[PDB]
Design a protein around this nucleic acid. Structure first.
Ligand SMILES: [Mg+2]
Ligand SMILES: [Mg+2]
Ligand SMILES: [Zn+2]
Lengths: 158, 39, 83, 227, 1112, 104, 94, 158
DNA sequence: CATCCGTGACACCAGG
DNA sequence: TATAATGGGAGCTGTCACGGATG
């Protein structure tokens, strides 16, 4: 068992699902130019499209692992429970996925690069928003959990 | 912790508090630790 | 009556447990006015005094148990078996 | 800098002619596995034993056929023959053919093999086959001397047209486990403690097997002498 | 070796001077190299001009100041625990208004600390670093009201502690309210005090619906300015007699006094730009010709009404915008403290000016410098931003100097900062690093300045962009603020260019941070480099584009913690920034001019320059840093060598030939090893210790004082009572350990005797004296001994005495002695290693070389990293770094792969093919074929789909090698690892967290005064804390007796702990405990609160826990 | 006797004077020269107890044989110094003052 | 795991009574120099020194093995405390 | 530091820690043997590191025989943050923690530290050995599911 | 029967 | 110990929930 860069196998299907997505992108763009879809409706449709695309590429990565490389290190570690979940494996082999602004609002432009392919400066910066948000949320959450535990202990100690 | 009836003298309340509080830092669409505290 | 965990803990009978949690001055003044006697029922009250907690090996249900070998047990049964 | 090395005490712990634990401590750092691994390889590959290598059963064409009058198939009989622990009392003997003819309601054991001069069947109570009313079993098995393990399709020895080759389980040793634990002698801190565990079939004992192993290894060490 | 460089981006401008935020700011604050008449009204000059003149009678005006030379150099200050400072004189003149007598004098105002060459200070001998502070820029803002949607708050903010916040609000009743010092009152009153008549307000604000009628109050226009002025003074001063010259004074000091109220020059500019007006000074109004004239209030109210109505061109303000948040550098903070000290000095001046001689008063007799001195000494010694300098390695110091804190005086109180202050705002692009920040409570509150970023004169952070006109990218570089940046479409620095022209039909760009695909006709600017988005530490992470930001954060922060090793190496894979980091941090020593190297020594380098001069460069050798790491320079030239200007002459700490060398290039295999690298633990090879890899020098300072006592003098002596010659072996004649000795825990470093107290001998003592016939000596051994778990080789002894020239200690101290102990720390089990991608781990096992996995040619690997650390952490960069490191292992070359523009997989595979040829054709020529174990591993790899079935062994081994994998042999068995393993060179550092400093234990020791509980901390030989949650653990277990031990026998049951120690040393079982002392302390501290606490029995009869000792 | 309960109650002025071993009349702590506790101050040995075990202030009595004895020359009892952790003093106010706990 | 810990948990109605019993028995062994042990010479727990095997000095290991033998009686109100103390001092002096 | 050779009920305790932690026991046992005349002489002998000889370590081995120490890791979120272990004296300065208990402590080996506590009395030692020993607390008090269970490399190899 | 306001509380170990 | 002197002066900028006051 080892980890080399060629073990984050990018599936053949990915490119398809990207093009297949871009196509379905313009069908939502035209519907906005002719008043069919409003602004928020177009935003929601784009986000749903990209969520389903992410699901499809995750399934593609894992089906490729199961069928062609059943002893792939990432796949074995994930399946056994030794390390990793599907979403991390997807970020390593498939695409990074949708990213969130500081306002929580999701970017319409998803990071299409996996960590094997390497992100662009703009993709990395866009992802730093959510990374920082999660870190600050964890930091503020541990203290509330501690206060809660102390209250529970004091109310149940006898 | 022993898969058998509790022993008398167990200090059940402290175990309850620690059992509830220990996963507190894992509670992350849902409602989360704020919902737990609100309850 | 339904209370949250904080108010339920602060409304407990033992004032050593309540003052050690929060609102120390309020708990202490209301307990001093009323001349509260803490009966040391819980674990916090006993920890504050350094007493053996009423739980585990400190439970009255088990802490008075005695152990004696059959040699000494029969050497004592003879004593009573005499007087 | 200056070192002193007490000669290690060798300790044996046997249970019959089938199993033994062998403890050698203390050993300088690393020599636990340095001694254990070669001995394990040798004990699993080069200790001389015997093995069933070919079986002819009358009126049986191939290995996956069934037999009328017998409940087991030929495969089960070949497995039971693989478990036959045969011992050669004479060091010159190299191969024997064992005859076995029985019928009627009976459960053949390893006893029923006709005795051959200087061939001790260590496990006569080993079950072979059961026959019924009208069951007939005429078979000859071939027992060769050898080492290690040779699949049937690697020797393929056939005395006649319907002699089925059997995977030759030569090795008298069935398992070798060993484990090195850290040990201390005073303020020597990283010394090693070797623990061998040898399972045999009774033809050779674990202590005998280990001595043959160390002898083979020393004789191989002697091969660095004459350029 | 050759250094092959990847990357296609051309760096138009280099990185600016990295410590310029410190050096330039302090230079501008001092203006020491500027002749007095040419000084600008900024810095301490502006503080002087603000304070002076001092009136009321007499007048004391300010002419000029001057800063003399430091009384001692920097090294001498470091040794004598002094401060690197310059004397501060100010020429002042006294004037009597009536007499006309003018007396002039140059008064001495104490000393001011000077900034060293690298941008740090020396405060009482310790190097310190003033950290820049980010805060909300002064000005006029408009924010949405949270309760009422259609309403908005107008906030007016001056500099911190330079005036009150003002709020303007449209109340639910319609009137426009103003909040000042927490007082809501109708704004119409103040508008009337300014001289605004209903004519002007009606013609100015009537256009905005019915809002102007909320400003129409008849009882306010009925009175003239003076009556409304006194009305507002009564509304703001309940009780204070509303005198006329009191109300005018208060209003002037609150709204128009430049010496009390002050927007920044930035606040001035932003008010002018936002409200579309022009300001005269830095206040909200003026006192002109006797009356108050408005400056800001009417424009602010106009904008607020226009925002509430909906007039186009009026939007709310993003207060997280880096165009509304500015930096306060060292100069501004030190200047504020200087201003405070000057105000106190002026108060004292007026005090002495009211009751004196009225004729016999010189400036010297009027100026007490002390209030100023203190105000400076307090800033550099006890400010939240005057931090102990982190000089673990040069990069740590540089990073510390480039920090940005939201905390500090006038900053956020922690536990009160929300998400907004901590968020990565879109305007952080190019200005503030989005990666380097602490994990924990301070997340998002301590940040780092980006690499190309600069702080302008007003305090806003600016980032550079190239100008693009008609698809042609110029070399004109413009530094923008965020507000300026929001005007343009800015393309990405990786857009393809055919030399100066945008060569892509569609280019990626930003519009107000928003990503957009535009045409080259729309591109107005372009980025300079990817480097400009991240800090310096993050910029040192190769393959950063492949690491998740969460581990990039750790890899960034941990370079700060790398220990300078005696054999430090630059990374095999660099980012192209390892040189500027050494140069700007003043780590290495470079050549001033072209010339020939005359002399090369272990302590100095003498160079003859083209001017014929003979310049000697001394080398700092084995000096102790703030963190004890050794900071020594080593000569890298030789006698007779020709050198050009800027050529390296001496490598500093953590520098290899001028490259940043924070660690070692080790040969790693990525595989599990028998659980010894379970959960981030690391397995290393003993060879690393044999060739002294990961070996560091550390120096510790020990200090003792002999002082005068009421009971006789303490004297540092060799004549220590009751000690053998073995105990005094390495002590010199004066009692101080000799240089060169080897000191272990328990050894004496400095002998000292102290007189005992009364010490009335208990009868046991007297009888023992008589039995042994030896007088009890008058003094006792109080020598300085080596603490537990410390020691090394004495390298220095310093001794200062009272009565010695140039020496004067604090009162009472007869003498001070310091001993420097140096130790050479090898890597040991429990020391912490890490790479640059956030892979950290403690060394859990050091195997002998013969147990290490080895290559087929017998080369053992150095480090064994567990693969399970990669997938969950998503830091594949270290994987790529390994692959490239493999090629460079056999080609014998290092690499430069800049971030986001560097080595791609196909080029790495080209290099790997060349490396495999070097690695395998050698063997094919030396007369060896492919090994049997190699054949078995190839069979397994064929099963894994890693190599094509049918090719020759060499072809398949080459395919594996191109995947970065090699055959590996188990050193314990000689059999191969069943699969091919990733093996390659990786850059790994030894962090500052070494177990040698952390292992601690205690049976018994010192106890606290009031609580009688064990002290805390290794340095105090303290006990671990058994807090509330550990008590909860024991309770939940039911360990009643273990818990009672923790609460009584082990902490503060005095009788209990004494009896327990005596029982244990006697072989007896420990006694039942008694009442812990801290409960008695609680009872007595409650009695002190007039509360009777009574321990009772079950019969409700009092129980005496004090054993009658407190009952009369 | 075993402790079983802990009562807390308000303390009367008479109770507080019952606790006190002597009124603290002076704001002085220790003498600036001898570094010994001043008379009638916040650290007076006459009130709170001896600094040294079984030794009065002046030094006329310095052994355990004297126990409970109050020196006639300096007024310091001969007991264990531990009592300086246990012995209350008091301050008699010229005007009564409200206990802020029971006010705010 | 303590040898025979499942059986010891089977011997009591509360896991903490087992601990009280074991600790009291260990103190009994420590006070009387182990002279009241119910273990035969072969059942004595042993400790490997540099010279050779010696008696295990851990009174708790002893008490648990004694409990495992069945030769011990535990319960509440078996004998007055000072009566037990004096009888054990008579049979086994200190 | 991980010790994978430990048994579930053991930890690795450095010699220099265990000496100080058990120091009164060590003085008593040093007096029992010939290592020192009395307790005071034994303490003076242990004062300096160069005065310590191998008989001291061999007597420390006998001092700790059968005893357990408590290991704690902050934060102590539940009762399994403290567990009892038979200490195995090791060279070096790092505590050796059993792999299967890591999850319960939430401990990895990227720099973590743990506190050690010596239960003194026979009663405390019996509590620690019966109730708080690691090998007796195998199931979670919270859900009852196994808490000490195969993890990472164990699962990987199996 | 609402709004406003003053006063509580806001994780652990380590070193500091 | 004697001319007359007669009302201060900073402040510097959380986040929520809860119980009591007021309006
Ligand atoms: Mg070993
Ligand atoms: Mg950790
Ligand atoms: Zn006296």
């Amino acid at each position: 068992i080892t980890i080399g860069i060629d073990d984050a196998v990018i599936p053949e299907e990915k490119k398809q699902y990207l093009e297949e997505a871009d196509r379905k992108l313009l069908q939502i763009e035209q519907a906005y130019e002719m008043g069919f879809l409003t602004d928020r409706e177009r935003y929601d449709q784009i986000l749903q499209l990209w969520t389903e695309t992410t699901e499809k590429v995750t399934q593609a990565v894992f089906k490729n692992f199961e069928e062609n490389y059943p002893f792939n290190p990432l796949y074995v570690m994930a399946q056994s429970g030794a390390r990793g979940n599907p979403q991390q494996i997807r970020q390593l082999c498939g695409l990074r996925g949708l990213m969130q602004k500081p306002s929580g609002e999701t970017f319409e432009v998803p990071v299409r690069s996996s960590f094997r392919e390497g992100l662009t400066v703009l993709e990395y910066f866009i992802s730093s928003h959510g990374a920082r948000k999660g870190g600050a949320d964890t930091a503020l959450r541990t203290a509330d959990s501690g206060y809660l535990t102390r209250k529970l202990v004091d109310v149940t100690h006898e | 912790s022993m898969a058998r009836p509790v022993s008398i003298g167990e200090a059940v309340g402290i175990v309850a508090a620690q059992s509830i509080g220990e996963p507190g830092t894992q509670l992350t669409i849902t409602q989360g630790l704020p919902r737990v505290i609100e309850l | 009556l339904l209370m949250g965990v904080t108010k339920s803990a602060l409304s407990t009978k033992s004032w050593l447990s309540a003052a050690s949690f929060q609102n120390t001055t309020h708990v202490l003044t209301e307990a001093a006015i009323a001349g509260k006697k803490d009966e040391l029922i819980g674990l916090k009250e006993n920890v504050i005094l350094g007493r053996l907690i009423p739980a585990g090996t400190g439970s009255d249900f088990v802490r008075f148990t005695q152990v004696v070998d059959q040699k000494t047990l029969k050497a004592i049964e003879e004593a009573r078996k005499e007087a | 800098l200056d070192s002193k090395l007490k000669a290690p005490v060798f300790t044996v712990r046997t249970q019959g002619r089938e199993y033994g634990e062998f403890v050698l401590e203390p050993l300088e750092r690393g020599f636990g596995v340095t001694l254990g691994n070669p001995l394990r390889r040798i004990l699993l590959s080069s200790i001389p034993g015997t093995a069933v290598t070919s079986v002819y059963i009358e009126d049986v064409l191939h290995e996956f056929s069934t037999i009328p009058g017998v409940k087991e198939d030929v495969v089960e009989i070949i497995l039971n023959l693989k478990e036959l622990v045969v011992r050669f009392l004479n060091p010159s003997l190299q191969t024997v053919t064992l005859l076995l003819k029985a019928e009627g309601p009976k459960e053949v054991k390893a006893r029923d093999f006709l005795p051959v001069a200087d061939v001790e069947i260590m496990n006569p109570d080993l079950h072979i086959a059961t026959l019924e009313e009208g069951g007939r079993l005429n078979m000859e098995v071939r027992v060769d001397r050898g080492v290690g393990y040779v699949p049937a399709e690697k020797h393929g020895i056939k005395d006649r047209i319907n002699a089925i080759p059997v995977d030759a389980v030569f090795s008298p040793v069935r398992r070798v486990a060993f484990q090195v634990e850290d040990t201390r002698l005073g303020q020597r801190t990283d010394l090693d403690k070797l623990t061998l565990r040898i399972w045999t079939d009774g033809s050779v004992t674990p202590l005998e097997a280990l001595n043959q192993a160390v002898e083979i290894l020393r004789e191989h060490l002697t091969y660095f002498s004459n350029p | 070796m050759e250094i092959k460089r990847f990357g296609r981006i051309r760096e138009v401008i280099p990185l600016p001077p990295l410590t310029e935020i410190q050096v330039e700011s302090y230079r501008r604050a001092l203006q020491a190299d500027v002749p007095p008449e040419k000084r600008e009204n900024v810095g301490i000059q502006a503080a002087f001009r603000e304070t002076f003149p001092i009136e009321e009678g007499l007048v004391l005006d300010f002419l000029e100041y001057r800063l003399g030379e430091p009384p001692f150099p920097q090294d001498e200050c470091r040794e004598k625990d002094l401060t690197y400072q310059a004397p501060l004189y100010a020429r002042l003149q006294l004037i009597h208004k009536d007499t006309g007598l003018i007396k002039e004098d140059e008064v001495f105002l104490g000393h001011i600390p000077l900034m060293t060459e690298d941008g740090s200070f020396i405060i009482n001998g310790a190097d310190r670093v003033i950290v820049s502070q980010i805060h909300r820029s002064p000005g006029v803002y408009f924010t949405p009201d949270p309760a009422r949607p259609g309403r908005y708050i107008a906030s007016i903010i001056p500099l911190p502690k330079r005036g009150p916040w003002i709020d303007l609000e449209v109340e639910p009743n319609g009137v426009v309210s103003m909040k000042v010092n927490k007082r809501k009152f109708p704004l119409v009153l103040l508008l009337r005090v300014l001289g605004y008549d209903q004519e002007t307000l009606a013609r100015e604000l009537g256009a905005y619906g019915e809002l102007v009628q909320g400003l129409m109050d008849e009882s306010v226009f009925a009175m003239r300015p003076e009556e409304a002025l006194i009305r507002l003074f009564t509304l703001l001063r309940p009780g204070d007699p509303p005198k006329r010259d009191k109300a005018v004074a208060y209003v002037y000091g609150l709204i128009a006094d430049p010496r009390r109220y002050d927007l920044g020059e930035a606040g001035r500019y932003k008010a002018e730009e936002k409200l579309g007006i022009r300001l005269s000074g830095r206040t909200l109004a003026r006192f002109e010709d006797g009356e108050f004239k408005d400056e800001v209030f009417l424009p602010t109210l106009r904008y607020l009404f226009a925002l509430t109505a909906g007039v186009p061109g009026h939007e709310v303000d993003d207060i997280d915008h880096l165009g509304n948040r500015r930096i306060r550098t060292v100069g501004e903070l030190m200047t504020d403290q200087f201003r405070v000290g000057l105000a106190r000095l002026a108060r004292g001046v007026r005090e002495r000016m009211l009751m004196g001689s009225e004729d016999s008063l010189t400036p010297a007799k009027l100026v007490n410098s002390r209030p100023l001195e203190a105000a400076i000494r307090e800033f550099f010694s006890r400010s939240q931003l005057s931090q102990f300098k982190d000089e673990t390695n040069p990069l740590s110091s540089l990073r510390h100097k480039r920090r940005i804190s939201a905390l500090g005086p006038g900053g956020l109180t922690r536990e009160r900062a929300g998400f907004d202050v901590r968020d990565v705002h879109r305007t952080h692009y190019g200005r503030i690093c989005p990666v380097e920040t602490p994990e924990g409570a301070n997340i998002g509150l301590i940040t780092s300045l980006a690499a190309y970023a600069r702080v302008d004169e007003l305090g806003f952070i600016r980032t550079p962009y190239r100008r693009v006109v008609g698809g042609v990218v110029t070399d004109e570089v413009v530094y923008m603020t965020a507000t300026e940046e929001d005007r343009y479409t800015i393309a990405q620095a990786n857009t393809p260019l055919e030399g100066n022209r945008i060569a892509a039909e569609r280019v990626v760009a930003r519009r107000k941070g928003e990503p957009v695909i535009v045409s080259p006709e729309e591109v107005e600017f372009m980025d300079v480099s990817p480097k400009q988005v991240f800090s310096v530490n993050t910029n040192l992470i190769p393959f950063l584009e492949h690491d998740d930001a969460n581990r990039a954060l750790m890899g960034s922060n941990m370079q700060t913690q790398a220990v300078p090793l005696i054999r430090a190496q630059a990374p095999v894979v660099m980012t192209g920034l390892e040189e500027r980091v050494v140069r700007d941090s003043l780590a290495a020593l470079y050549a001033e001019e072209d010339g020939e190297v005359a002399k090369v020594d272990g302590n100095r380098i003498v160079v003859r320059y083209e001017d014929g001069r003979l310049v000697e460069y001394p080398l700092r050798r084995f000096y102790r840093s703030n963190q004890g790491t050794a900071l020594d320079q080593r000569p890298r030239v030789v006698v007779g060598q020709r050198v050009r200007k800027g050529d390296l002459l001496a490598d500093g700490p953590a520098s290899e030939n001028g490259f940043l060398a924070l660690g070692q290039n080790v040969l790693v295999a990525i595989m599990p090893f028998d659980g010894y690298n379970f959960e981030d633990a690391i397995v290393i090879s003993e060879e690393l210790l044999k060739r002294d890899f990961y070996t560091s020098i550390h120096i510790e300072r020990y200090e003792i004082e002999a002082r005068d006592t009421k009971l006789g003098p303490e004297r540092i002596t060799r004549d220590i009572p009751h000690l053998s010659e073995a105990a005094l072996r390495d002590l010199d004649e004066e009692g101080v350990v000799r240089i060169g000795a080897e000191v272990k825990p328990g050894d004496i470093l400095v002998g000292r005797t102290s007189f005992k107290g009364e010490s009335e001998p208990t009868p046991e003592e007297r009888l023992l004296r008589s039995i042994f016939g030896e007088k009890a000596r008058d003094v006792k051994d109080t020598s300085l001994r080596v603490p537990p778990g410390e020691g090394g080789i004495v390298v220095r002894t310093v001794r200062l005495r009272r009565g010695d020239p140039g020496v004067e200690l604090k009162p009472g101290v007869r003498e001070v002695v310091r001993v420097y102990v140096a130790q050479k720390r090898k890597l040991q089990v429990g020391d912490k290693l890490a790479n640059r991608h956030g892979n950290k781990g403690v060394v859990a096992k050091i195997l002998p070389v013969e147990d290490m996995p080895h290559l087929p040619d017998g080369t053992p690997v150095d480090v064994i990293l567990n693969p399970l650390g990669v997938p969950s952490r998503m830091n594949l960069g270290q994987i790529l770094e390994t692959h490239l490191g493999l090629a460079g292992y056999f080609l014998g070359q290092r690499y430069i792969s800049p971030i986001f523009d560097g080595a791609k997989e196909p080029e790495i595979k080209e290099l790997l093919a060349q490396a495999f040829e070097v690695y395998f054709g050698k063997r094919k020529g030396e007369g060896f074929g492919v090994d049997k174990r190699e054949v078995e591993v190839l069979r397994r790899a064929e099963k894994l789909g890693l190599v094509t079935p049918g090719k020759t062994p060499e072809e398949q081994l080459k395919e594996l090698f191109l995947q970065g994998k090699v055959v590996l042999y188990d050193g314990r068995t000689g059999e191969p690892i069943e699969g091919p393993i990733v093996v390659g060179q990786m850059f790994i550092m030894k962090l500052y967290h070494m177990v040698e400093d952390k292992m601690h234990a205690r049976s018994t020791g010192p106890y606290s005064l009031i609580t009688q509980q064990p002290l805390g901390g290794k340095a105090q030989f303290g006990g671990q804390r058994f807090g509330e949650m550990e008590v909860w653990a024991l309770e939940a277990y039911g360990a009643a007796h273990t818990l009672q031990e923790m609460l009584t026998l082990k902490s503060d049951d005095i009788e209990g702990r004494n009896a327990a120690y005596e029982a244990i040393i006697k072989g007896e079982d420990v006694p039942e405990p008694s009442v812990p002392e801290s409960f008695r302390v609680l009872v007595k501290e409650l009695q002190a609160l007039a509360l009777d606490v009574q321990t009772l029995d079950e019969k409700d009869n009092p129980v005496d826990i004090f054993e009658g000792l407190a009952s009369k | 006797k075993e402790v079983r309960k802990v009562r807390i109650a308000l303390a009367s002025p008479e109770k507080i004077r019952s606790w006190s071993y002597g009124e603290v009349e002076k704001p002085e702590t220790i003498n600036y020269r001898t570094l010994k506790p001043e008379r009638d101050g916040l650290f007076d040995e006459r009130i709170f107890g001896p600094i040294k075990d079984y030794e009065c202030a002046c030094g006329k009595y310095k052994r355990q044989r004297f126990e409970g004895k109050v020196c006639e020359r300096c007024g310091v009892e001969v007991t264990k110094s531990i009592v300086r952790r246990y012995r209350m003093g008091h301050i008699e106010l010229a005007t009564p003052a409200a206990h802020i706990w029971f006010v705010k | 795991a303590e040898p025979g810990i499942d059986k010891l948990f089977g011997m009591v109605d509360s896991k903490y009574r087992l601990t009280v019993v074991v600790a009291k028995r260990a103190q009994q062994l420590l006070r009387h120099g182990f002279k009241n042990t119910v273990l035969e010479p072969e059942e004595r727990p042993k400790m490997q020194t540099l010279e050779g095997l010696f008696d295990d000095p851990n009174a708790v290991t002893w008490a648990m093995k004694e409990l495992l033998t069945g030769r011990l009686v535990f319960g509440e109100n078996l004998v007055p405390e000072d009566r037990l103390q004096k009888e054990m001092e008579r049979l086994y002096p200190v | 530091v991980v010790g994978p050779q430990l048994k579930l009920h053991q930890c690795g305790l450095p010699k220099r820690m265990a000496l100080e932690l058990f120091k009164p026991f060590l003085l008593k046992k040093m007096e029992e043997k010939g290592i020192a005349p009395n307790v005071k002489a034994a303490r003076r002998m242990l004062e300096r590191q160069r005065d310590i000889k191998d008989e001291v370590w061999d007597a420390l081995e006998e001092v700790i025989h059968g005893k357990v120490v408590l290991l704690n890791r902050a934060p102590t979120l539940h009762r399994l943050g403290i567990q009892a272990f038979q200490p195995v004296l090791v060279e070096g300065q790092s505590i050796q923690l059993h792999p299967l208990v890591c999850e319960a402590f939430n401990a990895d080996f990227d720099g973590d530290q743990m506190a050690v506590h010596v239960p003194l009395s026979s009663f405390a030692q019996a509590e620690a050995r019966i109730q708080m020993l690691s090998a007796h607390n195998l199931l979670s008090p919270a859900s009852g599911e196994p808490l000490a269970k195969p993890s990472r490399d164990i699962i990987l190899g199996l």
